[PDB]
mmCIF file of C-alpha atoms in Angstrom:
data_model
loop_
_atom_site.group_PDB
_atom_site.id
_atom_site.type_symbol
_atom_site.label_atom_id
_atom_site.label_comp_id
_atom_site.label_asym_id
_atom_site.label_seq_id
_atom_site.Cartn_x
_atom_site.Cartn_y
_atom_site.Cartn_z
ATOM 1 C CA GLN A 1 143.925 -51.864 102.902
ATOM 2 C CA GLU A 2 144.068 -51.649 106.702
ATOM 3 C CA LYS A 3 142.156 -54.592 108.147
ATOM 4 C CA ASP A 4 139.965 -54.318 111.277
ATOM 5 C CA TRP A 5 140.508 -50.565 111.415
ATOM 6 C CA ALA A 6 138.060 -50.162 114.311
ATOM 7 C CA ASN A 7 139.475 -53.111 116.271
ATOM 8 C CA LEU A 8 136.271 -55.115 116.548
ATOM 9 C CA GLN A 9 138.486 -58.061 117.584
ATOM 10 C CA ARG A 10 139.323 -56.361 120.898
ATOM 11 C CA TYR A 11 135.932 -57.178 122.524
ATOM 12 C CA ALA A 12 134.505 -59.784 120.097
ATOM 13 C CA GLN A 13 135.034 -62.795 122.412
ATOM 14 C CA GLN A 14 133.933 -60.857 125.503
ATOM 15 C CA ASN A 15 130.733 -59.684 123.829
ATOM 16 C CA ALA A 16 129.973 -63.255 122.754
ATOM 17 C CA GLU A 17 130.264 -64.582 126.355
ATOM 18 C CA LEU A 18 128.027 -61.863 127.884
ATOM 19 C CA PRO A 19 124.538 -63.175 128.537
ATOM 20 C CA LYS A 20 121.528 -60.990 127.763
ATOM 21 C CA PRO A 21 120.846 -58.754 130.737
ATOM 22 C CA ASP A 22 118.554 -60.086 133.525
ATOM 23 C CA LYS A 23 114.872 -59.147 133.481
ATOM 24 C CA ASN A 24 115.341 -56.504 136.202
ATOM 25 C CA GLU A 25 118.834 -55.452 135.049
ATOM 26 C CA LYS A 26 119.939 -51.995 133.989
ATOM 27 C CA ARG A 27 123.214 -52.719 132.204
ATOM 28 C CA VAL A 28 125.491 -49.732 131.621
ATOM 29 C CA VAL A 29 128.220 -49.687 128.927
ATOM 30 C CA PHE A 30 131.092 -47.169 129.002
ATOM 31 C CA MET A 31 132.293 -46.206 125.496
ATOM 32 C CA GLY A 32 135.644 -44.509 125.119
ATOM 33 C CA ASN A 33 139.379 -44.565 124.507
ATOM 34 C CA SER A 34 142.391 -45.252 126.833
ATOM 35 C CA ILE A 35 140.824 -43.075 129.559
ATOM 36 C CA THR A 36 137.880 -45.509 129.697
ATOM 37 C CA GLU A 37 140.100 -48.567 129.153
ATOM 38 C CA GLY A 38 142.475 -47.350 131.896
ATOM 39 C CA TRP A 39 139.475 -46.817 134.212
ATOM 40 C CA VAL A 40 138.780 -50.565 134.158
ATOM 41 C CA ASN A 41 142.531 -51.349 134.482
ATOM 42 C CA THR A 42 142.922 -49.037 137.497
ATOM 43 C CA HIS A 43 139.594 -49.580 139.301
ATOM 44 C CA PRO A 44 138.303 -52.925 138.027
ATOM 45 C CA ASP A 45 136.028 -53.177 141.084
ATOM 46 C CA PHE A 46 134.172 -49.930 140.188
ATOM 47 C CA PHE A 47 132.872 -51.785 137.165
ATOM 48 C CA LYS A 48 132.467 -55.221 138.728
ATOM 49 C CA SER A 49 130.688 -54.063 141.915
ATOM 50 C CA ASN A 50 128.207 -51.929 139.883
ATOM 51 C CA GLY A 51 127.691 -54.347 136.984
ATOM 52 C CA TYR A 52 129.071 -51.810 134.511
ATOM 53 C CA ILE A 53 130.714 -52.915 131.268
ATOM 54 C CA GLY A 54 133.863 -51.145 130.014
ATOM 55 C CA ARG A 55 134.295 -50.952 126.245
ATOM 56 C CA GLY A 56 137.206 -48.525 126.013
ATOM 57 C CA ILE A 57 140.002 -49.044 123.466
ATOM 58 C CA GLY A 58 143.236 -47.097 123.719
ATOM 59 C CA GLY A 59 144.235 -44.839 120.861
ATOM 60 C CA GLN A 60 140.834 -44.695 119.205
ATOM 61 C CA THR A 61 139.006 -41.694 117.779
ATOM 62 C CA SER A 62 135.275 -41.005 117.535
ATOM 63 C CA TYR A 63 135.427 -42.256 113.918
ATOM 64 C CA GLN A 64 136.423 -45.706 115.143
ATOM 65 C CA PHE A 65 133.918 -45.557 118.028
ATOM 66 C CA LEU A 66 131.132 -45.109 115.469
ATOM 67 C CA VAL A 67 132.176 -48.171 113.450
ATOM 68 C CA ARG A 68 132.161 -50.417 116.542
ATOM 69 C CA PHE A 69 129.160 -48.823 118.246
ATOM 70 C CA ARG A 70 126.673 -51.498 117.150
ATOM 71 C CA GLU A 71 128.869 -54.437 118.220
ATOM 72 C CA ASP A 72 130.285 -52.997 121.454
ATOM 73 C CA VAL A 73 127.181 -51.070 122.661
ATOM 74 C CA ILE A 74 123.912 -51.822 120.841
ATOM 75 C CA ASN A 75 124.261 -55.625 120.683
ATOM 76 C CA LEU A 76 124.907 -55.796 124.477
ATOM 77 C CA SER A 77 121.322 -54.590 125.057
ATOM 78 C CA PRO A 78 122.300 -51.935 127.605
ATOM 79 C CA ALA A 79 119.849 -49.697 129.443
ATOM 80 C CA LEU A 80 122.392 -46.885 129.195
ATOM 81 C CA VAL A 81 125.593 -45.893 127.427
ATOM 82 C CA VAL A 82 128.153 -43.437 128.831
ATOM 83 C CA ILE A 83 130.179 -41.755 126.038
ATOM 84 C CA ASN A 84 133.576 -40.129 126.574
ATOM 85 C CA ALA A 85 135.277 -39.190 123.308
ATOM 86 C CA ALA A 86 137.607 -36.909 121.311
ATOM 87 C CA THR A 87 140.890 -36.876 123.246
ATOM 88 C CA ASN A 88 142.433 -38.788 120.310
ATOM 89 C CA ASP A 89 140.503 -36.889 117.640
ATOM 90 C CA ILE A 90 142.226 -33.751 118.877
ATOM 91 C CA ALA A 91 145.536 -35.690 119.117
ATOM 92 C CA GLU A 92 144.921 -36.538 115.422
ATOM 93 C CA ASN A 93 145.363 -40.306 115.855
ATOM 94 C CA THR A 94 143.356 -41.007 112.649
ATOM 95 C CA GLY A 95 144.062 -37.773 110.752
ATOM 96 C CA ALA A 96 143.582 -34.009 110.885
ATOM 97 C CA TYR A 97 141.116 -32.750 113.497
ATOM 98 C CA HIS A 98 137.783 -31.318 112.291
ATOM 99 C CA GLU A 99 135.506 -30.335 115.178
ATOM 100 C CA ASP A 100 132.404 -30.566 112.962
ATOM 101 C CA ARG A 101 133.152 -34.194 112.074
ATOM 102 C CA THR A 102 134.175 -35.306 115.573
ATOM 103 C CA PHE A 103 131.064 -33.644 117.012
ATOM 104 C CA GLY A 104 129.003 -35.286 114.239
ATOM 105 C CA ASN A 105 130.335 -38.733 115.134
ATOM 106 C CA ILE A 106 129.181 -38.266 118.734
ATOM 107 C CA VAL A 107 125.770 -37.112 117.499
ATOM 108 C CA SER A 108 125.612 -40.262 115.307
ATOM 109 C CA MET A 109 126.285 -42.485 118.332
ATOM 110 C CA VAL A 110 123.550 -40.674 120.257
ATOM 111 C CA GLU A 111 121.115 -41.086 117.362
ATOM 112 C CA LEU A 112 121.911 -44.813 117.081
ATOM 113 C CA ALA A 113 121.490 -45.279 120.863
ATOM 114 C CA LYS A 114 118.102 -43.523 120.868
ATOM 115 C CA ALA A 115 116.981 -45.477 117.781
ATOM 116 C CA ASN A 116 117.619 -48.594 119.877
ATOM 117 C CA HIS A 117 115.981 -47.231 123.069
ATOM 118 C CA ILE A 118 119.286 -46.953 124.921
ATOM 119 C CA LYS A 119 119.630 -43.967 127.237
ATOM 120 C CA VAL A 120 122.704 -41.745 126.910
ATOM 121 C CA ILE A 121 124.991 -39.855 129.236
ATOM 122 C CA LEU A 122 127.416 -37.528 127.447
ATOM 123 C CA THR A 123 130.599 -36.381 129.144
ATOM 124 C CA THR A 124 133.293 -33.759 128.704
ATOM 125 C CA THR A 125 136.537 -34.581 126.989
ATOM 126 C CA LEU A 126 139.106 -34.411 129.788
ATOM 127 C CA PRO A 127 141.558 -31.501 130.005
ATOM 128 C CA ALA A 128 144.998 -31.894 128.477
ATOM 129 C CA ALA A 129 147.708 -29.272 127.993
ATOM 130 C CA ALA A 130 149.421 -31.496 125.406
ATOM 131 C CA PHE A 131 149.787 -35.091 124.199
ATOM 132 C CA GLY A 132 153.076 -36.906 124.813
ATOM 133 C CA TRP A 133 152.634 -39.117 121.736
ATOM 134 C CA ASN A 134 151.923 -36.124 119.455
ATOM 135 C CA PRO A 135 153.768 -32.970 120.588
ATOM 136 C CA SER A 136 152.971 -31.155 117.303
ATOM 137 C CA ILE A 137 149.494 -30.339 118.719
ATOM 138 C CA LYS A 138 149.996 -26.940 120.398
ATOM 139 C CA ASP A 139 146.339 -25.868 120.844
ATOM 140 C CA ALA A 140 144.688 -28.841 122.589
ATOM 141 C CA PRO A 141 143.275 -26.626 125.372
ATOM 142 C CA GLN A 142 141.444 -24.391 122.875
ATOM 143 C CA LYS A 143 140.100 -27.382 120.928
ATOM 144 C CA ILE A 144 138.985 -29.351 124.016
ATOM 145 C CA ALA A 145 137.168 -26.329 125.501
ATOM 146 C CA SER A 146 135.390 -25.545 122.213
ATOM 147 C CA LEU A 147 134.204 -29.137 121.680
ATOM 148 C CA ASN A 148 133.016 -29.443 125.291
ATOM 149 C CA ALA A 149 130.998 -26.215 124.998
ATOM 150 C CA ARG A 150 129.362 -27.571 121.834
ATOM 151 C CA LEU A 151 128.626 -30.972 123.450
ATOM 152 C CA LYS A 152 127.123 -29.252 126.484
ATOM 153 C CA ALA A 153 124.738 -27.287 124.304
ATOM 154 C CA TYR A 154 123.813 -30.382 122.215
ATOM 155 C CA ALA A 155 123.084 -32.319 125.413
ATOM 156 C CA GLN A 156 120.804 -29.574 126.745
ATOM 157 C CA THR A 157 119.153 -29.208 123.285
ATOM 158 C CA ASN A 158 118.170 -32.892 123.421
ATOM 159 C CA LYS A 159 117.566 -33.364 127.189
ATOM 160 C CA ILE A 160 120.601 -35.674 127.599
ATOM 161 C CA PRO A 161 122.517 -35.697 130.894
ATOM 162 C CA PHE A 162 125.980 -34.110 130.532
ATOM 163 C CA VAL A 163 128.669 -34.920 133.084
ATOM 164 C CA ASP A 164 131.389 -32.291 133.547
ATOM 165 C CA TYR A 165 134.554 -34.219 134.437
ATOM 166 C CA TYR A 166 136.558 -31.290 132.980
ATOM 167 C CA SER A 167 135.669 -28.568 135.508
ATOM 168 C CA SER A 168 136.577 -30.803 138.464
ATOM 169 C CA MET A 169 139.909 -31.909 136.902
ATOM 170 C CA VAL A 170 141.316 -28.858 135.075
ATOM 171 C CA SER A 171 144.069 -26.657 136.573
ATOM 172 C CA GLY A 172 146.421 -23.814 135.595
ATOM 173 C CA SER A 173 146.216 -21.142 132.900
ATOM 174 C CA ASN A 174 147.247 -23.773 130.331
ATOM 175 C CA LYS A 175 144.146 -25.861 131.266
ATOM 176 C CA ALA A 176 146.240 -28.888 132.210
ATOM 177 C CA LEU A 177 144.868 -32.034 133.705
ATOM 178 C CA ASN A 178 145.554 -31.484 137.420
ATOM 179 C CA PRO A 179 148.927 -33.037 138.431
ATOM 180 C CA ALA A 180 147.143 -34.461 141.513
ATOM 181 C CA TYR A 181 145.113 -36.578 139.047
ATOM 182 C CA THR A 182 147.693 -37.628 136.404
ATOM 183 C CA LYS A 183 151.331 -38.508 135.748
ATOM 184 C CA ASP A 184 151.484 -37.916 131.964
ATOM 185 C CA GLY A 185 149.092 -34.962 131.574
ATOM 186 C CA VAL A 186 146.385 -37.013 129.852
ATOM 187 C CA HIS A 187 145.513 -40.268 131.655
ATOM 188 C CA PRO A 188 143.949 -40.122 135.129
ATOM 189 C CA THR A 189 145.495 -41.806 138.151
ATOM 190 C CA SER A 190 143.453 -43.532 140.851
ATOM 191 C CA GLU A 191 142.691 -40.184 142.513
ATOM 192 C CA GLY A 192 141.491 -38.761 139.198
ATOM 193 C CA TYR A 193 139.177 -41.725 138.628
ATOM 194 C CA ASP A 194 137.766 -41.231 142.154
ATOM 195 C CA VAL A 195 136.552 -37.802 141.016
ATOM 196 C CA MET A 196 135.021 -39.270 137.846
ATOM 197 C CA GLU A 197 133.291 -42.065 139.778
ATOM 198 C CA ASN A 198 131.537 -39.654 142.148
ATOM 199 C CA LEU A 199 130.280 -37.623 139.193
ATOM 200 C CA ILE A 200 129.223 -40.481 136.901
ATOM 201 C CA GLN A 201 127.586 -42.586 139.674
ATOM 202 C CA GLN A 202 125.206 -39.760 140.553
ATOM 203 C CA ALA A 203 124.265 -39.193 136.912
ATOM 204 C CA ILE A 204 123.701 -42.921 136.285
ATOM 205 C CA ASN A 205 121.537 -43.326 139.406
ATOM 206 C CA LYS A 206 119.534 -40.216 138.480
ATOM 207 C CA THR A 207 118.967 -41.327 134.866
ATOM 208 C CA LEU A 208 118.009 -44.935 135.674
ATOM 209 C CA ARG A 209 115.960 -43.887 138.726
ATOM 210 C CA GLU B 1 147.815 -37.789 106.174
ATOM 211 C CA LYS B 2 145.385 -40.541 107.175
ATOM 212 C CA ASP B 3 141.803 -40.537 105.849
ATOM 213 C CA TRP B 4 140.640 -44.128 106.026
ATOM 214 C CA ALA B 5 137.085 -43.387 104.818
ATOM 215 C CA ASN B 6 138.220 -40.868 102.160
ATOM 216 C CA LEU B 7 136.219 -37.889 103.419
ATOM 217 C CA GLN B 8 138.449 -35.738 101.206
ATOM 218 C CA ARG B 9 136.908 -37.230 98.045
ATOM 219 C CA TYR B 10 133.681 -35.152 98.293
ATOM 220 C CA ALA B 11 134.594 -32.532 100.932
ATOM 221 C CA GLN B 12 134.886 -29.554 98.523
ATOM 222 C CA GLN B 13 131.847 -30.640 96.501
ATOM 223 C CA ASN B 14 129.703 -30.968 99.598
ATOM 224 C CA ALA B 15 130.782 -27.537 100.794
ATOM 225 C CA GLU B 16 129.709 -25.825 97.531
ATOM 226 C CA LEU B 17 126.258 -27.485 97.410
ATOM 227 C CA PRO B 18 123.544 -25.074 98.519
ATOM 228 C CA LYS B 19 120.782 -26.315 100.821
ATOM 229 C CA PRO B 20 117.904 -27.785 98.822
ATOM 230 C CA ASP B 21 114.270 -26.822 98.556
ATOM 231 C CA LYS B 22 111.814 -29.650 99.591
ATOM 232 C CA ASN B 23 110.340 -29.411 96.085
ATOM 233 C CA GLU B 24 113.820 -30.020 94.572
ATOM 234 C CA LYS B 25 113.631 -33.643 95.868
ATOM 235 C CA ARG B 26 117.361 -34.076 96.415
ATOM 236 C CA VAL B 27 118.388 -37.696 96.152
ATOM 237 C CA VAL B 28 121.839 -38.965 97.169
ATOM 238 C CA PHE B 29 123.217 -42.301 95.951
ATOM 239 C CA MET B 30 125.563 -43.966 98.480
ATOM 240 C CA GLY B 31 127.836 -46.751 97.339
ATOM 241 C CA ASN B 32 131.107 -48.081 95.994
ATOM 242 C CA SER B 33 132.569 -48.285 92.436
ATOM 243 C CA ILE B 34 129.205 -49.489 91.063
ATOM 244 C CA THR B 35 127.683 -46.163 92.164
ATOM 245 C CA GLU B 36 130.799 -44.143 91.257
ATOM 246 C CA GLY B 37 130.882 -45.820 87.827
ATOM 247 C CA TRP B 38 127.184 -45.010 87.341
ATOM 248 C CA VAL B 39 127.981 -41.279 87.373
ATOM 249 C CA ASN B 40 131.068 -41.838 85.188
ATOM 250 C CA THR B 41 129.095 -43.814 82.599
ATOM 251 C CA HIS B 42 125.744 -41.947 82.616
ATOM 252 C CA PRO B 43 126.514 -38.498 84.007
ATOM 253 C CA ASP B 44 123.267 -37.168 82.494
ATOM 254 C CA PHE B 45 121.124 -39.630 84.474
ATOM 255 C CA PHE B 46 122.234 -37.768 87.560
ATOM 256 C CA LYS B 47 122.270 -34.264 86.088
ATOM 257 C CA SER B 48 118.876 -34.421 84.386
ATOM 258 C CA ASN B 49 117.202 -35.793 87.541
ATOM 259 C CA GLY B 50 119.006 -33.676 90.146
ATOM 260 C CA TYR B 51 120.560 -36.768 91.722
ATOM 261 C CA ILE B 52 123.840 -36.631 93.618
ATOM 262 C CA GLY B 53 126.349 -39.475 93.322
ATOM 263 C CA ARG B 54 128.468 -40.167 96.396
ATOM 264 C CA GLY B 55 130.064 -43.469 95.408
ATOM 265 C CA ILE B 56 133.722 -44.251 96.129
ATOM 266 C CA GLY B 57 135.473 -47.231 94.497
ATOM 267 C CA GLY B 58 136.825 -50.028 96.686
ATOM 268 C CA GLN B 59 134.913 -49.011 99.812
ATOM 269 C CA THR B 60 133.062 -51.283 102.238
ATOM 270 C CA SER B 61 129.959 -50.599 104.362
ATOM 271 C CA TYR B 62 132.328 -49.847 107.284
ATOM 272 C CA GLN B 63 133.755 -46.880 105.373
ATOM 273 C CA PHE B 64 130.272 -45.848 104.162
ATOM 274 C CA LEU B 65 129.157 -45.534 107.796
ATOM 275 C CA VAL B 66 132.089 -43.270 108.695
ATOM 276 C CA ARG B 67 131.305 -40.878 105.845
ATOM 277 C CA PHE B 68 127.507 -41.127 106.034
ATOM 278 C CA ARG B 69 126.968 -37.899 107.961
ATOM 279 C CA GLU B 70 129.224 -35.806 105.704
ATOM 280 C CA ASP B 71 128.271 -37.317 102.336
ATOM 281 C CA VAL B 72 124.543 -37.908 102.992
ATOM 282 C CA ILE B 73 123.075 -36.277 106.114
ATOM 283 C CA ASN B 74 124.744 -32.870 105.741
ATOM 284 C CA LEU B 75 123.429 -32.581 102.151
ATOM 285 C CA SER B 76 119.842 -32.509 103.552
ATOM 286 C CA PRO B 77 118.526 -34.962 100.976
ATOM 287 C CA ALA B 78 114.881 -35.942 100.747
ATOM 288 C CA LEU B 79 116.052 -39.485 100.038
ATOM 289 C CA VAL B 80 119.152 -41.701 100.134
ATOM 290 C CA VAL B 81 119.621 -44.746 97.884
ATOM 291 C CA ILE B 82 122.012 -47.289 99.490
ATOM 292 C CA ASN B 83 123.851 -49.953 97.503
ATOM 293 C CA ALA B 84 126.472 -51.753 99.578
ATOM 294 C CA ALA B 85 128.459 -54.898 100.393
ATOM 295 C CA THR B 86 130.100 -55.930 97.107
ATOM 296 C CA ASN B 87 133.474 -55.011 98.659
ATOM 297 C CA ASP B 88 132.545 -56.314 102.134
ATOM 298 C CA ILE B 89 132.136 -59.751 100.557
ATOM 299 C CA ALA B 90 135.347 -59.191 98.537
ATOM 300 C CA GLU B 91 136.972 -58.542 101.958
ATOM 301 C CA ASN B 92 138.522 -55.181 101.003
ATOM 302 C CA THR B 93 138.727 -54.032 104.673
ATOM 303 C CA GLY B 94 138.941 -57.479 106.334
ATOM 304 C CA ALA B 95 137.173 -60.820 106.803
ATOM 305 C CA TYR B 96 133.489 -60.833 105.865
ATOM 306 C CA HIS B 97 130.931 -61.040 108.684
ATOM 307 C CA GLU B 98 127.372 -60.822 107.423
ATOM 308 C CA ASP B 99 126.112 -59.686 110.844
ATOM 309 C CA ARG B 100 128.467 -56.689 110.840
ATOM 310 C CA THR B 101 127.968 -55.696 107.208
ATOM 311 C CA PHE B 102 124.186 -55.963 107.664
ATOM 312 C CA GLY B 103 124.485 -53.998 110.899
ATOM 313 C CA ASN B 104 126.371 -51.188 109.110
ATOM 314 C CA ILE B 105 123.509 -50.862 106.641
ATOM 315 C CA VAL B 106 120.973 -50.852 109.498
ATOM 316 C CA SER B 107 123.055 -48.098 111.185
ATOM 317 C CA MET B 108 122.882 -45.984 108.004
ATOM 318 C CA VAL B 109 119.126 -46.501 107.833
ATOM 319 C CA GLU B 110 118.716 -45.546 111.499
ATOM 320 C CA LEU B 111 120.831 -42.398 110.992
ATOM 321 C CA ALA B 112 118.825 -41.457 107.869
ATOM 322 C CA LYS B 113 115.477 -41.866 109.682
ATOM 323 C CA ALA B 114 116.791 -39.952 112.721
ATOM 324 C CA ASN B 115 117.391 -37.089 110.293
ATOM 325 C CA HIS B 116 114.047 -37.461 108.426
ATOM 326 C CA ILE B 117 115.697 -38.714 105.247
ATOM 327 C CA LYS B 118 113.777 -41.400 103.373
ATOM 328 C CA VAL B 119 115.602 -44.570 102.392
ATOM 329 C CA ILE B 120 115.630 -46.912 99.454
ATOM 330 C CA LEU B 121 117.595 -50.104 100.036
ATOM 331 C CA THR B 122 118.887 -52.100 97.099
ATOM 332 C CA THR B 123 120.246 -55.570 96.437
ATOM 333 C CA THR B 124 123.950 -56.136 96.248
ATOM 334 C CA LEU B 125 124.554 -56.917 92.575
ATOM 335 C CA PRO B 126 125.334 -60.479 91.484
ATOM 336 C CA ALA B 127 128.945 -61.550 91.071
ATOM 337 C CA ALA B 128 130.335 -65.026 90.445
ATOM 338 C CA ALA B 129 133.758 -63.883 91.621
ATOM 339 C CA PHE B 130 135.975 -60.826 92.139
ATOM 340 C CA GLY B 131 138.962 -60.347 89.810
ATOM 341 C CA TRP B 132 140.937 -58.456 92.472
ATOM 342 C CA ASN B 133 140.368 -61.194 95.090
ATOM 343 C CA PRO B 134 140.088 -64.682 93.534
ATOM 344 C CA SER B 135 140.367 -66.373 96.968
ATOM 345 C CA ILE B 136 136.644 -65.670 97.523
ATOM 346 C CA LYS B 137 134.942 -68.812 96.182
ATOM 347 C CA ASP B 138 131.442 -68.383 97.676
ATOM 348 C CA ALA B 139 130.415 -64.852 96.659
ATOM 349 C CA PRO B 140 127.121 -66.074 95.161
ATOM 350 C CA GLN B 141 126.066 -67.716 98.439
ATOM 351 C CA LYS B 142 127.075 -64.659 100.494
ATOM 352 C CA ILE B 143 125.411 -62.138 98.165
ATOM 353 C CA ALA B 144 122.135 -64.109 98.081
ATOM 354 C CA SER B 145 122.097 -64.509 101.880
ATOM 355 C CA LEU B 146 122.735 -60.808 102.560
ATOM 356 C CA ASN B 147 120.108 -59.779 99.982
ATOM 357 C CA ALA B 148 117.525 -62.080 101.605
ATOM 358 C CA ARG B 149 118.287 -60.517 104.988
ATOM 359 C CA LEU B 150 118.110 -56.966 103.589
ATOM 360 C CA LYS B 151 114.810 -57.787 101.872
ATOM 361 C CA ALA B 152 113.274 -58.999 105.139
ATOM 362 C CA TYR B 153 114.584 -56.003 107.050
ATOM 363 C CA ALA B 154 113.179 -53.639 104.411
ATOM 364 C CA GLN B 155 109.733 -55.267 104.474
ATOM 365 C CA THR B 156 109.653 -55.292 108.291
ATOM 366 C CA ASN B 157 110.407 -51.554 108.392
ATOM 367 C CA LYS B 158 108.392 -50.510 105.300
ATOM 368 C CA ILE B 159 111.441 -49.393 103.366
ATOM 369 C CA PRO B 160 111.358 -49.729 99.565
ATOM 370 C CA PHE B 161 113.723 -52.468 98.376
ATOM 371 C CA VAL B 162 114.891 -52.413 94.775
ATOM 372 C CA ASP B 163 115.846 -55.760 93.299
ATOM 373 C CA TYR B 164 118.610 -55.005 90.785
ATOM 374 C CA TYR B 165 119.848 -58.581 91.359
ATOM 375 C CA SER B 166 116.912 -60.513 89.845
ATOM 376 C CA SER B 167 117.026 -58.472 86.616
ATOM 377 C CA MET B 168 120.812 -58.793 86.271
ATOM 378 C CA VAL B 169 121.700 -62.314 87.446
ATOM 379 C CA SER B 170 122.338 -65.183 85.016
ATOM 380 C CA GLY B 171 123.562 -68.795 85.038
ATOM 381 C CA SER B 172 123.677 -71.452 87.761
ATOM 382 C CA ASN B 173 126.757 -69.694 89.193
ATOM 383 C CA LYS B 174 124.657 -66.505 89.670
ATOM 384 C CA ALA B 175 126.983 -64.388 87.526
ATOM 385 C CA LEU B 176 126.357 -60.785 86.595
ATOM 386 C CA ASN B 177 124.888 -61.151 83.095
ATOM 387 C CA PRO B 178 127.615 -60.800 80.413
ATOM 388 C CA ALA B 179 125.197 -58.488 78.521
ATOM 389 C CA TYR B 180 125.590 -56.052 81.437
ATOM 390 C CA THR B 181 129.311 -56.320 82.326
ATOM 391 C CA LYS B 182 132.827 -56.865 81.011
ATOM 392 C CA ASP B 183 134.566 -57.936 84.255
ATOM 393 C CA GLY B 184 131.787 -59.855 86.059
ATOM 394 C CA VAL B 185 131.245 -57.156 88.708
ATOM 395 C CA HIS B 186 130.874 -53.634 87.275
ATOM 396 C CA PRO B 187 127.905 -52.773 85.053
ATOM 397 C CA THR B 188 128.256 -51.419 81.527
ATOM 398 C CA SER B 189 125.953 -48.797 80.009
ATOM 399 C CA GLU B 190 123.352 -51.485 79.242
ATOM 400 C CA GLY B 191 123.469 -52.709 82.858
ATOM 401 C CA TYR B 192 122.969 -49.174 84.162
ATOM 402 C CA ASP B 193 119.940 -48.794 81.822
ATOM 403 C CA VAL B 194 118.306 -51.685 83.725
ATOM 404 C CA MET B 195 119.167 -50.122 87.096
ATOM 405 C CA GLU B 196 117.854 -46.717 86.027
ATOM 406 C CA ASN B 197 114.443 -48.065 85.083
ATOM 407 C CA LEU B 198 114.147 -49.829 88.439
ATOM 408 C CA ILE B 199 115.462 -47.064 90.669
ATOM 409 C CA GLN B 200 113.554 -44.240 88.893
ATOM 410 C CA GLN B 201 110.226 -45.927 89.554
ATOM 411 C CA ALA B 202 111.046 -46.513 93.219
ATOM 412 C CA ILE B 203 112.239 -42.917 93.679
ATOM 413 C CA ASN B 204 109.133 -41.459 91.991
ATOM 414 C CA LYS B 205 106.872 -43.726 94.055
ATOM 415 C CA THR B 206 108.577 -42.857 97.348
ATOM 416 C CA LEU B 207 108.681 -39.061 96.766
ATOM 417 C CA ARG B 208 105.261 -38.603 95.095
#
């Protein structure tokens, strides 16, 4: 029996010390994995200067995101949640990859957000040629592209903003994360996050306008 | 490989199930070993009514949530019956937090409604103690508190709430009635007879 499988302990104390948002406040929570966690670690001031809350946890899949969605998103009373998911689903961090199930987990998070009157921005899974921690995955590019196409369509089907980090960050015939934006092929550097900030800021301002 | 929520348990079964007709009134039962054991003990209750059992022994509400889409939503049921939390309180997947366990059940309800599936909520069954985890000394207090909270939630949101607990509890220690169990937790045939009468009426009322 694996205890605290979704790592609710990671943000439990932080969540407890967050006051309810101010009357006029439009609190934004970023849900994700090490790309979202690393965003806060690399550009802490992007979050602090905008009032944004980072709830990324390294290594996690969409299955784990769903289990902690109520505690790390809903209970913070955000105006908006930004969801970036599936890098680790495709890396098979919690088991074999099934696009239908990973996609379904993202849909579940959307449905929970809307049930609680939280707006949603969906985003593309970032490009990766391969994963250093799991080299057995030889078809990440095919899987990432297929999931992103499906998420794009779902977003349009339900009038949800969809932010395309992927198209601004992909390079080469192998659909690698651009070497200008990464050192390990997966996690953005400062320059990569600069690209993501420009894109997400505009979408957030538009949606909360 | 890893499969923390045991999606493999019903994967093949789910895949072979044709889409229902509205008039078929497909009902799915979500739960743990109490729901799994229901099918094992009275298979004809399920077969003769066209009910689908999706219980998995040992599981907590956290695991239920992970497999909810695959084992409930994708079956396009008219109705889902949820019985949960026995193993949350037994701490099968970690320390018990009523807020989180309750929240998992609310999440399942919200997902069901988002997909136009009706819901029947049910009381966690009484248990004085759990044989597999004797360190839990306050199960009665925790079960009663969660059931009170589920009852209030159900009434606030006009969701039928089936009180297995009041028909099955006995003694000052709030044990599962010895007439209905051999181990203090899992119902026998006679216990399931009580549950069938209660749930049938609620299902017929909700789908009429």
